[PDB]
Amino acid sequence: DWEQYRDRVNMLQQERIRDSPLLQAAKENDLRLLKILLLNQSCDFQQRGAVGETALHVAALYDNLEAATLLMEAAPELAKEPALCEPFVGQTALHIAVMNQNLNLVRALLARGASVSARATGAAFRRSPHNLIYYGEHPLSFAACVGSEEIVRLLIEHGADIRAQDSLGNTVLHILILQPNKTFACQMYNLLLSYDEHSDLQSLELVPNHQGLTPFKLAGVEGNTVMFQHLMQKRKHVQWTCGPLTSTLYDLTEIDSWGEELSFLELVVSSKKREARQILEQTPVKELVSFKWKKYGRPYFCVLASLYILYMICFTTCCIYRPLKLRDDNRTDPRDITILQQKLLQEAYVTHQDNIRLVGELVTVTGAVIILLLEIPDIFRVGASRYFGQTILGGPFHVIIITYASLVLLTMVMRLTNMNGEVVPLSFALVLGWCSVMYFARGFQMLGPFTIMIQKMIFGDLMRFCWLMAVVILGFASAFHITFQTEDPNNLGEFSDYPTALFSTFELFLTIIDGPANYSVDLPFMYCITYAAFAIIATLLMLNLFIAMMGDTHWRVAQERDELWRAQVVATTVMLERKMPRFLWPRSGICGYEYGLGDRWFLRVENHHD
Amino acid sequence: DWEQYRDRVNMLQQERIRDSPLLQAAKENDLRLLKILLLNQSCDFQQRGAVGETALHVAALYDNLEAATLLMEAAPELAKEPALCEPFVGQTALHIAVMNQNLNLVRALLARGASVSARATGAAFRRSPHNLIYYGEHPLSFAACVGSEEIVRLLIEHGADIRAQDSLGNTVLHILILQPNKTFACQMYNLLLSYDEHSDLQSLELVPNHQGLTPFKLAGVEGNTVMFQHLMQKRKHVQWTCGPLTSTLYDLTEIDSWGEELSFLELVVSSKKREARQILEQTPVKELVSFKWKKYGRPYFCVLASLYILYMICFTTCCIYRPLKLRDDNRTDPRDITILQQKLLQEAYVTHQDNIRLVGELVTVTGAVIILLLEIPDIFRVGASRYFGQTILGGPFHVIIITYASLVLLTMVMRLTNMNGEVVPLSFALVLGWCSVMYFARGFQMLGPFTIMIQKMIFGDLMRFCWLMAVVILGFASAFHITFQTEDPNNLGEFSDYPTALFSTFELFLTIIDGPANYSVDLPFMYCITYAAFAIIATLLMLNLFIAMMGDTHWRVAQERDELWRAQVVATTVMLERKMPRFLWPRSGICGYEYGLGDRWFLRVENHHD
């Protein structure tokens, strides 16, 4: 929760420990004062602290086995007392004794009758970035997550339910997977699977949490590669081993996820963790997505890319041959250079070429409607921020594709209603529609990690550098405008108006226009000093600083090009499996039923070991 | 072959193993059930699997020595039974027993009379990228490639022919060289040479395969540097060793390859493997090509470069002084600026300077004919794709040189036929002919690894980045054309026509022209927003991204500059040895016959060891 509230809670807990002499003796392991208190019978033994902790909780917290046994000899009901305050509600002495790995204290508490199924629904025991650890809500979950196998065996022998869930629905396998240390996690997973004598019901592995994730899916989502390898070791079958050639037969019941709302690969790719992209490098998943991409994903993606390119060619040809007529009125203003205008709806669609344009425009409108019908339910199937905010699963390409379809439909509306100004949505749709073709650059290895470079340059570096650049533009444009306020605009009109001054200074920042010079006339002397300062500071230092930032970003992406391209391949394959019809996408892998191996589907992997 | 077919074959093989109780007992090493089957006499013992494998093949496949001896005690004819299906045709139990290194099983099979010359012509035993290994087609080849020397000795003692070839003609030395692991390969090569008691016939080393490669040539082609060093250890003679100076005398019978169609160095350089360029760094080859390049290659290459430069000077001077006359007709169109045209064949070649031009044009046509006569039979001596598609042996320089000669001859044809439009082939030939002079940059160390940088930037990076760049050009050119469709073209004519809009936006992408600005008139407001987006996205992000890609490509080539330059030196020296007359290229090395060492030719290497 709040850091200040937890600090006040800890300070109040230490204050109530230091104020109470029984709690002070329990903390400091003062056996004489504690025995004088307990042998004495002032009739008080349940003094609670600031968090509602008993004296047994204080004895277990500071590793005081002798003081805890003294507190359990007299009035042993403290072995069945949880805390009664917000940051530690539900925590007993058994939880602290398990977390401190005091095995004799856990033995003594289970001898005195500790609650082995004590569900600690505390604020500090929830999975949150405020808490440093998430060990669970049960003593068995705590003992499995800490790493003491003997305490796990002791709690199981006393009757701790392995199939117990948290507030998030997580069983002990989920919280065991969620731990960062993974050396002992595989052995603890083996121990908890070995103690599943129940085996009735479904196996603990098939138990989903409240998010609907199995432990296999949670190992996929969180990027736990070691637990993923340990899980696939239990689901593989070595067919044969001849010399150095080992042929094994992995099971694809959970990896492929046939007939499910969210497949395993979709959950792996659409994950906020950076370590989830290493699951695609693992042994069954890499061969599975390579088979899917090489057999079905690449030809279908190339066909869709060719259709989209021809569609954009038709839209561009309809933009070029747009119906325009001569201007009716006279150009009274000498600075106005508009000689054509848009024809009316009655004036257009007359000749044969206009009917060809009508056919192409119907093709364009139908394609935009098809685009909207393909993209709109994906914003409601998952979250809008998740669908619009991930690099791997398209992302900004979907936003500009939906914007392109919306602008094409708006152009159609303005065409049918005889509204002037189709140049703005047609230019927007021509820029956005052609730039969306780079989405289909993710289907090729050489060009795919380039769109990721451009994405991590625009939203990565350009959105940070544009504030300093805009500050320099807003300074020097105002300076250049006020130096040329008392000047004739016919000789040097690059700073005549302040919007034009902003645009001209932006161009001079990017060095795409020449410096404003008119040597036939006498420019003001302040312009030369201001432009020398602009050339030193803006065009030389900051522009090449942005060039170096883009170079470092390109190097950072190019050091991990194949991983990002494989992630894009899996994202594209998942999207094509979800959206295309099922008869064009047969089920991947060996059928297995024709070979007598049941209804499961397998992937055969032949490797060259030693 | 196909991955799905091999997967179906393996699944069917495991299905037929699991269905048959004899094969199941042979796989699982169930001695009791197997003895009940064999001691029983249901009169069946040759049940074949899905691949035609016997029960002895299943026993040898899963390392079941006891089950294999039980299957060989009753009906031992299974020791002489190969498989009878496509992926394993010709494979016996001896092959699997050798590959599994079960020495007692190989002893038992040779005791029962296994076929020691069993030629396994299977689909899985062929050298292909589908197969993970290529161990050969014979049990001796399998035992030499796996690494068990005792099984090699056992097979040789029973009469396995060492001089046996595969479907590719490869003997056991070729397949032993083709293995990736090279520590045991030298010892196995020594063992197989030591067992060549035949020594009649030619030595196994001089036995070529179906591609015509000796094991020395195959070690050169595949880049096996360790086997190359081991082969040159057997062909060197240490003349003396005084202090730290060791003078040895390498033999150049196979490295130089006098009087052969394909020399050793040509096969090393024209190799698809990247590791073949390390053969040129080895001890005799480096000194040999350095002697050849320093004595003969560099002066002849500099003479040819000077002749080609003077030839291009003559061609350029004939292009500058091209016969042109005043235009006969009148310039009716105000946008037409053509004032000259080409003179007729009768009108030209009149004055003295025209006769000097005629002499130069005859020189140019003769040089192009000489160029075609030098380059045309090289396209038929080797493959066309091999000759036109390798960086080291010229490659694109040969294509542009042949194109230059073809365009010069086409210009001559258009000159003789009075056909208008010599400017197109003359401009093409002037661009391509002068750019071919960079071919002669490969003869100098400092400038040579620069043409490789440009080649790996054009075909490496430019051919990948040009699709995204063309996408941005096709978007923004159409946007800029439709914003200036309803505008007067006299004020801003950079986007008047769509081809001119494409060209102007390509120039604005490369920042070689200024931004289109006409401050005397009022430009449309959409142009400013579209050009600000073009300046942000195209000229700033993508152009400098391509700059960073070229920087990384230049760094990648510059980290290996000397290796690539030495490869180009060997390629140039091989080309000059092949194409120049023999009297200008004396045989390299010590003659040897005058010193009583036979007809062989030697290279003396003096090195400073310790």
Ligand SMILES: CC(C)[C@@H](C)/C=C/[C@@H](C)[C@H]1CC[C@H]2C3=CC=C4C[C@@H](O)CC[C@]4(C)[C@H]3CC[C@]12C
């Ligand atoms: C038309 C003008 C007014 C302005 C709006 C135009 C903006 C275009 C050029 C910009 C806006 C956002 C840009 C953009 C958004 C995000 C991505 C995803 C990235 O992975 C590749 C580049 C890509 C695809 C680029 C392409 C160019 C876009 C679409």
Ligand SMILES: CC(C)[C@@H](C)/C=C/[C@@H](C)[C@H]1CC[C@H]2C3=CC=C4C[C@@H](O)CC[C@]4(C)[C@H]3CC[C@]12C
């Ligand atoms: C430096 C960063 C922030 C980049 C991205 C922004 C550039 C700014 C300065 C650019 C982007 C688009 C430009 C722009 C849009 C359109 C017009 C209308 C035109 O008739 C006058 C110039 C004017 C008013 C300019 C002003 C400067 C703008 C707003």
Ligand SMILES: CC(C)[C@@H](C)/C=C/[C@@H](C)[C@H]1CC[C@H]2C3=CC=C4C[C@@H](O)CC[C@]4(C)[C@H]3CC[C@]12C
């Ligand atoms: C004349 C115009 C129309 C066009 C066709 C001209 C193209 C020229 C400039 C281009 C085409 C291909 C280019 C090219 C091909 C390949 C190589 C081999 C490389 O190792 C060095 C650069 C070099 C030699 C370059 C030189 C420049 C060339 C020849």
Ligand SMILES: CC(C)[C@@H](C)/C=C/[C@@H](C)[C@H]1CC[C@H]2C3=CC=C4C[C@@H](O)CC[C@]4(C)[C@H]3CC[C@]12C
């Ligand atoms: C971005 C990459 C793909 C680079 C290599 C390609 C550039 C394209 C856009 C260039 C290359 C040559 C250019 C070109 C060739 C010749 C002409 C004829 C001229 O009268 C009008 C422009 C026009 C029609 C332009 C159009 C744009 C072209 C085709």
